[PDB]
Amino acid sequence: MIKMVIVVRSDIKMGKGKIAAQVAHAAVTLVVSIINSNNLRWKEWLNEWLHQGQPKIIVKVNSLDEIISRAKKAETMNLPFSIIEDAGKTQLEPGTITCLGIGPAPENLVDSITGDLKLL
Amino acid sequence: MIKMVIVVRSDIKMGKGKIAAQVAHAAVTLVVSIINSNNLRWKEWLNEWLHQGQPKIIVKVNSLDEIISRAKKAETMNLPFSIIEDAGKTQLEPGTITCLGIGPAPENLVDSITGDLKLL
């Protein structure tokens, strides 16, 4: 199964409405970046993901370093990823990294990155 | 200003992660549907929306009837819209309507449909 995983930071303050917007931001940025790419593998995974109902896994981490660690993992393995920063319209200061999107891609491939995280 | 609004049902039990997943589902479905359409106006709005930072307004309604009412208004106004239903992997029964996505579209068109709703 092909899946998309979004890693959300738990150490910053975000209401459920805020969290939903950030996760949606991560997902849209990933999809658009893939469509605008010339990476055939990524496009194949995206098409399958859509056919499978857009399965998503929303997990969390309690530090910025844990997000950077996983983004580097995704990058090294040539997987699609998106680092989302706040637009600073509310509490949070603009530029604050809120979450990381990865995929869509084979879930076992993605698990070699986020298989140890707790669900949000 | 172009905006996307996602109307979430508050009368059904959904936790933080569930809500985030449903909202991301509405957002991605909207974007993909616009990219694959033959609607130039919609595509222009989508492009402007991305350039503007993908602003999203997440509001709530307390009944399914309200969701259908707003979907009807979106449809009559020829705006992109998406009715999202649960995959039934958790508490909720599959097929349960969880939220409605509208847009991206000019702020005034979107607000004429959801401007009276409370933020989630």
From Swiss-Prot, chains A, B:
Known catalytic reactions: an N-acyl-L-alpha-aminoacyl-tRNA + H2O = an N-acyl-L-amino acid + a tRNA + H(+)
Database matches in HAMAP family: Pept_tRNA_hydro_arch (MF_00628)
SUPFAM superfamilies, per database record: Peptidyl-tRNA hydrolase II
Full protein name: Peptidyl-tRNA hydrolase
Organism: Saccharolobus solfataricus (strain ATCC 35092 / DSM 1617 / JCM 11322 / P2) (Sulfolobus solfataricus)
Family per record: Belongs to the PTH2 family.
Cross-referenced InterPro entries: Pep_tRNA_hydro_II_dom_sf (IPR023476), Pept_tRNA_hydro_arch (IPR034759), PTH2 (IPR002833)
One GO term describing the cellular component: cytosol
